[PDB]
Amino acid sequence: ADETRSFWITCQAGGTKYLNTNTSNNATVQYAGGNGNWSTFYIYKVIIPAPRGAELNGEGRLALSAMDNISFTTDPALAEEAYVLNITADGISVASSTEKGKFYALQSLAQLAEGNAEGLPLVRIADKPRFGYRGFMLDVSRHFFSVAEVKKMIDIMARYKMNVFHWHLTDDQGWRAEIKRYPKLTTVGATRSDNVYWTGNGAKTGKPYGPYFYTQDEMREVVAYAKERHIEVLPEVDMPGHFVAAMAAYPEYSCNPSRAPQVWTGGGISSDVLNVANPQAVEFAKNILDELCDIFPYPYIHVGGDECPTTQWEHNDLCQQKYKELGLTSYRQLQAHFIKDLADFVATKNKHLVCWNEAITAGGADLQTQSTIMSWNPCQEGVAKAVKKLGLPAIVKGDGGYYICRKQSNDYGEPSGAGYGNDGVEGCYNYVPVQGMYTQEQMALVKGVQGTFWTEHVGTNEYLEYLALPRLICVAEAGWTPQVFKNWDNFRTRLANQTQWLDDHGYVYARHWMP
């Protein structure tokens, strides 16, 4: 019973045993020079040693398919992320077109062995993802996690076979992505005068806070890591709105520079935008969207467009001198005409765009099609009609169910947090992002699901996992498992038995399910 239920599966009679007292050998089949054969196997074999001791190397002739037990053939008519894992008491044929394909094939397999290793039955496991957008996303804007950890959230992304990591480098409360034509944004941005966050009543804890941020070559480590677990990474930077961080520390552009701005210690909404009506406030942006590109080789940048009042535009007579230029009378639509510019100007050296889906809110006919919404408030109805039906791709961070960063149970010693019990685990794979979705184009413009985390009240390792886990999985199963074979009754079960992991490798995890 492997995980993120396989598309299609079979059983067969009486079981193999790896044999590693001597071995259970390799047989990767070259082509696609190295790439994903031996190579992304070499980090296999090593899988790990500490369980059993792999012991594969070659002792004999790894590379003859004739007494070869675990053969790594290529049949390049296989789709990319798709694998075909035969398990017999002779060995383990694993086919795959693209290393991505083949990476997963030994994931399932692993978990087919004992929950540790040595002792599988027989099976055939054709399996492939509904969505290649099975997403996460980490609010590292209100907070830094250390990388020991950041890594330890890609760790899981892996188990349950998601690929992208999306990254919240910047919101008001701090900025956490080093731009070197603008060190300040990180030296002052990234710093703040408090651990915590208000939110009307809650106070701050007037105690300084930092590790500031992530120097460029603390990215290029990260943005590397993933690739061997094929986790591509949307850089995001809430633009221009959620920018107190990057305004207090470069206000001259702003919409009142004379006015004493500073990093934020509470939460919720800021209005404090990047005066997007002054052709240097722009450059500022445009020169950021340079820096990213380089460090992030993934062909999207996530730009936000979310919940940004126009407050300081209305009364800014640059950003109402432009609003005659542009040629229209909806003043959301700098957010059109600021984002416009991001596209065609990052379409002359190469990269695309994503956004939150409030940015619909204008005549979202000003930008481009060719732009890839990521909605949450009215979920289904959000990536529906002026996104799919006007040919804009789209994701669906179901606010409901899939913000796996809301209190997961109303119990009376669950820590603080927002919620109302209304997000538990009977509630978060049940949440159906295929609620009568006509396929016309609306499932070749839907790209998939993504299980964000929002930090305000939540800021240490323990408790984020305690919240995160298990729900992460649910967003990741649905993500992968196709909506024909999707009922829980036997989800619970299989996924009690993935806590013995969360244990071994020192993951905190809820339990609610678990006896």
From TrEMBL:
Superkingdom of origin organism: Bacteria
Molecular functions per Gene Ontology: beta-N-acetylhexosaminidase activity
Keywords: Glycosidase, Hydrolase, Signal
Residue ranges of domain Beta-hexosaminidase bacterial type N-terminal in the record: 67-127
EC id: 3.2.1.52
Protein name, as recorded: beta-N-acetylhexosaminidase
All copies of domain Glycoside hydrolase family 20 catalytic, residue ranges: 131-482
Catalytic activity: Hydrolysis of terminal non-reducing N-acetyl-D-hexosamine residues in N-acetyl-beta-D-hexosaminides
Enzyme class (EC, first level): hydrolase
Listed GO biological process terms: carbohydrate metabolic process; glycosaminoglycan metabolic process
Annotated Gene Ontology cellular component terms: membrane
